[PDB]
Design a binder for these strands. Structure first.
Lengths: 124, 262, 185
RNA sequence: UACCUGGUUGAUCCUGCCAGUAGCAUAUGCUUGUCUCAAAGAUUAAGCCAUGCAUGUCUAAGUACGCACGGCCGGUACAGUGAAACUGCGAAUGGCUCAUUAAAUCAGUUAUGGUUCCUUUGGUCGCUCGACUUGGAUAACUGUGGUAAUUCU
RNA sequence: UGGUGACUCUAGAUAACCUCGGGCCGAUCGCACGCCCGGCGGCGACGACCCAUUCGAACGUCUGCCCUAUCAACUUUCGAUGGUAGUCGCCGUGCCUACCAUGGUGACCACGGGUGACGGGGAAUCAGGGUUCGAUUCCGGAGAGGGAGCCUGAGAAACGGCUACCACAUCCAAGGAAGGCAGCAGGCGCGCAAAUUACCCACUCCCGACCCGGGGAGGUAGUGACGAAAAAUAACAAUACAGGACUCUUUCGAGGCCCUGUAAUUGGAAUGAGUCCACUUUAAAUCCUUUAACGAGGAUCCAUUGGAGGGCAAGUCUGGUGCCAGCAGCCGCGGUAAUUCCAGCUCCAAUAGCGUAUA
RNA sequence: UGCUCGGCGCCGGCCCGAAGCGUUUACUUUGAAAAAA
């Protein structure tokens, strides 16, 4: 029912990955999730569904055709090496600190207020 | 201001960089280099637009700093390095090389070249200098000071140097009847043969260059880059051969390609 | 210093005389006959025709056998042919000054659907365009002020999601069925 | 669209102005369902400011004896991560405003053969005819204090 | 030797100088580790007097700026004009010193004054020719209350650097300390007049010893009828009934099938705002799009804003006060028959927009 | 518009190209350089 056709296929060895744009055809249905097209592209390219990253999926008027951008890596270490941190956090492979900019700024000003070893003591 | 500027806006960029408008407020100001700021092409725009190997600013750094890009033989680790006219870019991993040459319009174009041709770079001499102990110096357009040149090299000639040695191999004298191409100005990238040159004392000299189709024109002397002897070139020409088609005939061949594509 | 555009132009134009009999007469006649909403779109059609007329006057001001004159003369004539309002045999530069508002309004999507015979009235055609029922080459269009090109004239049909062209029945049909088996059982 | 109309007289023809007509951008009034863009303390006060933020910085390559953690066989000093501090760099960029300024600023064209230039790039760096590594001061640290307070000492 | 259109140019030769507040001629640090017989070796990092190059800056040449005569002579040894020799300056020159003659500009508008004057790229209007504005995102210039002076640094007369004055102003045990939002938010004043004491460095760049850190530069969201673009408030029949279209009854009547139009009789073809699951977008959401289940008959899921004598579209309608109240941009309406006032019915204008005042 | 150098061709020579000169302005026509939006 739901088919995947791709275009603009290019392979670069300088990033150890292959990237392409993905066209999804799902007539009379809601827009597809990322996990289903990830495992479908995993079945298409004979790759484990853990180094495939997809993002930026928009919907045309009518909903017959949806486009998006994806990429296929070569191993998990290359995907952990050169990728944005937010997309790895979306895949759950990275966690970011839950501190706001504000309290960090008064913390930085409070260590700027005092001089010596007590900078680490006043930072709490 | 109180010092040198460090920022560049998007609309203040030169048009041959030819990038967009709404996707950002600041533009990549190139680092200090051999070429001037107006006609140079920094590596980040070329990598993320002409080849589309990267998408973001940090991805260009993750391309560049790992000793994967060789500009004029040596490796460059700066994303804003100005790669100007007549420079070779080497991709050792993928396996092709590029030469930065002007297209028939006022912009740079990608040129796939064979690797064994990518061992020499043409340089245009700017001035002749004598060192502190009678040492002749040969200052080129890319600020590459060459010591002990041939005595036959005059002020406005061109030389062919070797990249891995930095030494002179061949040269072409500047006279009537040589294949020249125009760098800079409103006229840009045209391929023609020099016909005559006048001399103006105290003013800019102007030459007259005839196109291979007979469409003669005239540019200033400082915008002159001779590349060939007679009509046989040395470097590989790009598509269109710098012929400057007036708008009707490339409209006609665009329509012709429209029915030929189907 | 933001990354904005600030590029916008007016599409319609307000006439000099506010109240007059005859101008209101054929303006109301065009609105009633072509199923238009109000006078803003007929004023913007007048403004587009004024732009094309000004370009034609400027191009005929220039002398013969100038490459710019031939260049956007061929460009303007090719664009007007590709719209489909101009006939193929009238391939001349000075024929631009000889067509009117209803020629431009003939290539509207609303009246094209009305002349295709798949709609009853012109207002019914406007409602049926407005309510997502007609696709233009596998692309649904919900707006009536769509300039149908000559190449896309033979590819106008109902949407596949519409109940008229074959699909699921509408909301009031299933509600009527639910009321039918509610009253029957 | 290269466009007019009412008004001095008992009635006519004129100069002439007043008032209608359309756009533009400021305030304000009434009103208001969807959606894409988008201006926004400038006209008076370049008037006064409480608060919080806006400039910081380490690699394989300048200083590591803070056990703050931490690897072993400790024995030819230093495995390694490393707060702090010394050192070099930038803080003269960016951002806001139009008060002053009338050949002043600025625009196009010219010259530095009348000067300077952080940094990048290329060259120069055994071109001079006469120690197999020198010296003492200060940080950080420990300890001792005064002030009503300070990025004070 | 070499070059310019042109050097007192570059280079060459000779004689010396060469500042203790001092020009250079490496006492620096990592990676991989070896050959020959203790010396000898690759790839780098940092620093350095010099040249050229690059970003520039700086002083100059020619041409071009609003109004004003109730501004016709102005400037001068307290230097305005040129010459000679100097000081300082990174060079050039009254920039400044000592000496010389009185010079230089002006009716082709100097000098003086005002500007509700930052300049330009531009914006509105527009037959042609023109008028007005430009604080405002790009470029350049100036300043951080106003003058003045200065350290460091290559680059500052710097103000999120310092010093002194006056104005303003914080704390105090009264001896003394600490100040500059014409930055991002916010408050007061002012005025007719102008928004959140929000989130993020993910996108675009910038700075640093530099993949890794930071950035109210910026991006995102909210407020937002400044303004611009698209675009809902309805469509489809049989009968409540008036006539035209092809043919007749001298004339009423008829076939009238396309009919055409209007009034709250009937049931359907429906989809959208909103309520919402999900998916998608995104640093994370929200906005848009897709998609389940809901969701319209007087489809109360109710469209206003100004007018109806002339300009100028549009009632000699009805009722009331009757030169009063008032209307009216201008003519003029109001006196107990108001085509203008005050309220209902109908109608026209533009329409999610319309009216008024200012330039 | 003409008067000291050497070019396309022929046996001290004809032509062609000239180092250098070839009386002043406005006007008109062709080129260059003329930031982006």
């Amino acid at each position: 029912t739901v088919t995947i056709r791709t275009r603009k296929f290019m392979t670069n060895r300088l990033l150890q990955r292959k990237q392409m744009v993905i066209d999804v055809l799902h007539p009379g249905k809601a827009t597809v999730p990322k996990t289903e097209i990830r495992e479908k592209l995993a079945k298409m390219y004979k790759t484990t569904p853990d180094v495939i990253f997809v993002f930026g999926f928009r919907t045309h008027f009518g909903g017959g055709k949806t486009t998006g951008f994806g990429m296929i890596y070569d191993s998990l270490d290359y995907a952990k090496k050169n990728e944005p941190k937010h997309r790895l956090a979306r895949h759950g492979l990275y966690e970011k600190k839950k501190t706001s900019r504000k309290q960090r700024k008064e913390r930085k000003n409070r260590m700027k207020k005092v001089r010596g070893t007590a900078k680490a003591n006043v930072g709490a | 201001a109180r010092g040198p500027k460090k920022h560049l806006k998007r609309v203040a960029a030169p048009k041959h960089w030819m990038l967009d408008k709404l996707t950002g407020v600041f533009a990549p100001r190139p680092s200090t280099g051999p070429h001037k700021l107006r006609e140079c092409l920094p590596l980040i725009i070329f990598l993320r637009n002409r080849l589309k190997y990267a998408l973001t600013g940090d991805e260009v750094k993750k391309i560049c700093m790992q000793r994967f890009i060789k500009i004029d033989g040596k490796v460059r680790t700066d994303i804003t390095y100005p790669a100007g006219f007549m420079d070779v870019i080497s991709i050792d991993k993928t396996g092709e090389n590029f030469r930065l040459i002007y297209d028939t319009k006022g912009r740079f174009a990608v040129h796939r070249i064979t690797p064994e041709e990518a061992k020499y770079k043409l340089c245009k001499v700017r001035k002749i200098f004598v060192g502190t102990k009678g040492i002749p110096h040969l200052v080129t357009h890319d600020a590459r000071t060459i010591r002990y040149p041939d005595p036959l090299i005059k002020v406005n000639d061109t030389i062919q140097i070797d990249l891995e040695t930095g030494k002179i191999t061949d040269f072409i004298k500047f006279d009537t009847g040589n294949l020249c191409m125009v760098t800079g100005g409103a006229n840009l990238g045209r391929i023609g043969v020099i016909t005559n040159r006048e001399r103006h004392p105290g003013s800019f000299d102007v030459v007259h260059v005839k196109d291979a189709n007979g469409n003669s024109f005239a540019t200033r002397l400082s915008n002159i880059f001779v590349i060939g002897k007679g009509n046989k070139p040395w470097i590989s020409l790009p598509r269109g051969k710098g012929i400057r088609l007036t708008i009707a005939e490339e409209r006609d061949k665009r329509l012709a390609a429209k029915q030929s594509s189907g | 210093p933001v990354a904005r555009s600030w590029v916008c132009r007016k599409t319609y134009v307000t006439p000099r005389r506010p109240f007059e009999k005859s101008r209101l007469d054929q303006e109301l006649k065009l609105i009633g006959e072509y199923g238009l909403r109000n006078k803003r779109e007929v004023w913007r059609v007048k403004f587009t025709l004024a732009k094309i007329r000004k370009a034609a006057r400027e191009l005929l001001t220039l002398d013969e056998k100038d490459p710019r004159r031939l260049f956007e003369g061929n460009a303007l004539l090719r664009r007007l042919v590709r719209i489909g309002v101009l006939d193929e045999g009238k391939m001349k530069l000075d024929y631009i000054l000889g067509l009117k508002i209803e020629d431009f309004l003939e290539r509207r999507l609303q009246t094209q659907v009305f002349k295709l015979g798949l709609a009853k009235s012109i207002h019914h055609a406007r409602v049926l365009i407005r309510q997502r029922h007609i696709r233009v080459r596998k692309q649904v269009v919900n707006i009536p002020s769509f300039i149908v090109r000559l190449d896309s004239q033979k590819h106008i049909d109902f949407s596949l999601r519409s109940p008229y062209g074959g699909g699921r029945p509408g909301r009031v049909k299933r509600k009527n069925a639910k009321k039918g088996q509610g009253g029957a059982g």
